[PDB]
């Protein structure tokens, strides 16, 4: 009898925990809805305003700060942003590094979605000014908004989160990249739903950023800048099922050691002296993706099969020490060395780097197997590998989110974007640690990495046929990404 009452109370507690865990990865509407091809959650929603925002000056703000201080500052800033999202009727998607993005009109339609996004961006600039005042920082917001059709849903099985995928989302990311710190960079489409209530000026993308590798003046697309305006057993079974659901949804957000550390403190922050990051992008997905049939939804279903395949790699016993951080469009983000809280006896100090490298190789194999099931089209995986100190942290109190920050993640994303398809590009220090472990690398050349200038990069699969001559890529010009990838939040600005 008393056991039944205790089971009921703890079942209410665990139901609340599961609801909170679901709310952290899905919108309240979809979260309430929850309560051959793998299951695929995606819908085509029109008239959605997508907003991206980058913390300009993040690299200097995070310099010479401990993990606790940096994670606290990020938590304060993102809490202000979340309050702003609640006020402006926007829906925050996720935060990546120094980036914050949201959608208005998704999943619930809004007639003033463009207004919601513009107001939220302007408020974010104001809140960043307040954050600078209170925290004695010098940072700004570079906001970019574009309105169009999105495909919103869930990709993959592990660390899945509600996100938005479309050419319009990529265009909004482009708007953010080409924008000005402290101003909202709206696309030509967004200005069609806006009246004269804002102080609007020409975007001047061609004048400011000079070259436009995306197209000739955004392929003839204008842009604007806005600066402002029996009973016991049954109860035991039920509570066991609810607890399994709650802990599985908690594992979907934060790693297991982070779960242990969060049982005592409401905040988590760790400084890892040695951690490895890989960014694995699917380069030619844009070639595969086509909006002609069902807005491209079915195409992303194919992507849902590939990412989920990567999610089956984490279940292997060999890759238990590897944590998937996030998936960004067609990019897979993974890390290693975070779980190594205790130095296990007999283990190499850099064994996590070897395990992460083997994970990247197995991702290459998985991509090959996936292409074996495609009809005269081959998906190409491009992996960037780096290692070094980083800062891991949980962002938020109600809606949890695990993330990592530092020059290590930035350099890993740089090797992902500057790498070559079907090969793994590892950083210089990553080469120095991997090659000592029996791995062979081809010296690709030097890549322009911020804070290191020309830094040597090594492509993993040593092509016996022909030779990889030093490319010596010195391109320091702004790398404008025409699609959502791992560079989101991993490329600090002025």
């Amino acid at each position: 009898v008393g056991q039944s009452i205790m089971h009921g109370k703890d079942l209410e507690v665990e139901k609340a925990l599961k609801e909170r865990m679901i709310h952290s990865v899905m919108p309240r509407i979809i979260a309430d809805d929850l309560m051959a091809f793998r299951p695929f959650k995606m819908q085509q929603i029109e008239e959605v305003s997508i907003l991206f925002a980058d913390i300009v000056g993040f690299t200097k703000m995070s310099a010479n700060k401990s993990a606790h201080a940096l994670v606290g500052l990020l938590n304060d800033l993102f809490g202000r942003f979340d309050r702003l999202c609640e006020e402006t009727k926007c829906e925050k998607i996720s935060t990546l590094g120094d980036c914050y993005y949201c959608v208005a009109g998704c999943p619930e339609p809004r007639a003033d979605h463009a207004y919601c996004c513009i107001e939220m961006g302007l408020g974010m600039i104001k809140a960043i000014e307040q954050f600078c005042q209170e925290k004695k920082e010098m940072v700004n917001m570079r906001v970019g908004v574009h309105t169009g059709t999105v495909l919103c849903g869930i990709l993959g099985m592990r660390r899945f989160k509600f996100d938005v995928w479309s050419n319009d989302v990529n265009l909004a990311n482009l708007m953010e990249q080409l924008g000005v710190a402290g101003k909202v960079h709206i696309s030509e489409a967004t200005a069609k739903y806006l009246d004269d209530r804002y102080e609007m000026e020409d975007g001047k993308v061609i004048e400011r950023l000079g070259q436009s590798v995306v197209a000739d003046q955004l392929k003839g697309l204008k842009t604007y800048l806005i600066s402002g305006q029996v009973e016991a057993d049954l109860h035991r079974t039920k509570i066991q099922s609810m607890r399994d659901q709650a802990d599985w949804l908690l594992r979907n957000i934060i790693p297991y050691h982070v779960a242990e550390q969060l049982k005592v403190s409401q905040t988590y922050s760790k400084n890892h002296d040695s951690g490895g990051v890989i960014f694995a992008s699917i380069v030619n997905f844009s070639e595969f993706y086509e909006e002609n049939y069902e807005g491209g939804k079915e195409c992303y279903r194919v992507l849902n099969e590939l990412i989920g395949d990567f999610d089956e790699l984490l279940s292997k016993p060999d890759y238990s020490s590897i944590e998937k951080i996030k998936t960004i469009g067609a990019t897979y983000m993974a890390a290693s060395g975070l779980n190594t809280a205790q130095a296990q006896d007999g283990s190499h100090p850099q064994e996590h780097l070897q395990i992460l490298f083997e994970f990247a190789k197995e991702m290459m194999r998985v991509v090959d197997d996936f292409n074996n099931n495609m009809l005269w089209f081959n998906f190409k995986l491009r992996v960037g590998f780096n290692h070094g100190p980083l800062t891991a942290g949980v962002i938020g109190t109600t809606k949890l989110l695990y993330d990592i920050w530092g020059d290590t993640v930035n350099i890993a994303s740089r090797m992902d974007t500057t790498g070559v398809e079907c090969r793994i590009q590892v950083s210089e220090e990553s080469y120095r640690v991997l090659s000592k472990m029996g791995y062979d690398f081809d010296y690709r050349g030097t890549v322009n990495v911020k804070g290191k200038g020309q830094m040597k990069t090594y492509l993993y699969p040593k092509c016996t046929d022909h030779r990889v001559i030093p490319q010596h890529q010195l391109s320091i010009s702004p790398d404008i990404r025409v699609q959502v990838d791992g560079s989101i939040g991993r490329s600090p600005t002025d």
Partner: protein, 334 residues
Amino acid sequence: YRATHRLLLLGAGESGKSTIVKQMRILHVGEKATKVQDIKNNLKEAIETIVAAMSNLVPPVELANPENQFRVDYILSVMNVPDFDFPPEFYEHAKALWEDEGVRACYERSNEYQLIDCAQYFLDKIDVIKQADYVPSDQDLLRCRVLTSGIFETKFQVDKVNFHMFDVGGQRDERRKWIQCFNDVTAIIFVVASSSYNMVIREDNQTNRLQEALNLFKSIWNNRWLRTISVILFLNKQDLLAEKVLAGKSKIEDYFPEFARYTTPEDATPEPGEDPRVTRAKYFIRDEFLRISTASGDGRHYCYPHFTCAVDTENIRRVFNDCRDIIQRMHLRQ
């Protein structure tokens, strides 16, 4: 949605999938000017292809009548001119060339280049087509050839049963789109140009069309997301196969050497009056895909071969009648 049968038409290029869609529209279901325009475009494409291939064949084919030589040059002159108005001079020159014996001899060697399937049908109808009041018949619409790019959907109803036909493109560059229709698909209808055993595909001009279809069917049958999807094999272009077999100019064994040792199966059910050679060739082509299907037929899905002639309305009606019960049975199995 649960009560409708999603039939995805697959197969290599120019297999006949669009003609099967047209047959479904004819049976169970401004624009006429467009249809006439594509018919005339097919006519022009056929005549220019034959004329150009006359000098490109090995050995080159000379004109039977030298006085028609200039008639060739005009055809060469306007080969690459888009938005052709099709003047009466063009129609007269095309008819005169088609009545020339050298052009016909070049046409008999159409397997040595890439020629559309509706060549002879429209080159024998030039006089009717050239009229300003030309009304295209149902057979004329069925014979018209238009390359299909993208995914097209046709919804029709037979005996209060809903069918959703997904027509795709058969060329390699289009096959990457096919996976967009592999989800919740009731059936796959794999159309094969059975008469194309002596022809090479347009993509590289080297791979045999029937071998390309066999490779494509191997890929489809052994697909990860089509493991439990039964494939209804449409062995199409049976009439052209019969003409090619009775002609004897392009033997089946000269491109598939295993046909020489092949023998007609005892379960064969030829149509009355059918030549034994046509029966043997068509059943060899059927068994070529049956081998692939049985190489991985672990009981999850089955191959249903049908000898179809897409331009034949009655034959396609009978084939679809024979396939409706199979389709509903597999929908139940889903």
